[PDB]
Design a protein that fits this description.
80% helix, part of a larger assembly, 2 chains, mainly alpha, 50 residues, rod-shaped, Gap junction alpha-1 protein (chains A, B)
Chain lengths: 50, 50
C-alpha cells in the first residue's frame, strides 16, 4: 500500500504481542511459584535452626 | 501532505473549472447571438434578391 501509517496499524493488528515476549512472560510466570516455594523452604530451615 | 490522491481532490475543489476554459465559454456564448443575427441578415438579403 501507499497509505501512510497503514504498515504500523497492520503490524499492530497482526501481532498484538510478540511471541518472544509472550514466551518470556510465560516462563517468568511458571518460574515464580517455584521461587516462592524455595524461599519458603529456606525460611522453614531458618525456623528449624532456631 | 503524504496522502495519496489528496492533491487530485484538492486541486479539483480549488478549481471547479479552469479560468481559461471559463473565459472561452464566455466569449463563445457572447459571440453566438452576433453570428445568429449576421446569418439572419444574410437570409434577409437573400429574400431581398428574389
Amino acid at each position: 500500500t501507499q497509505q501512510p501509517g497503514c504498515e504500523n496499524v497492520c503490524y499492530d493488528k497482526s501481532f498484538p504481542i510478540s511471541h518472544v515476549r509472550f514466551w518470556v512472560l510465560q516462563i517468568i510466570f511458571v518460574s515464580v511459584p517455584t521461587l516462592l516455594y524455595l524461599a519458603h523452604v529456606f525460611y522453614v530451615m531458618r525456623k528449624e535452626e532456631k
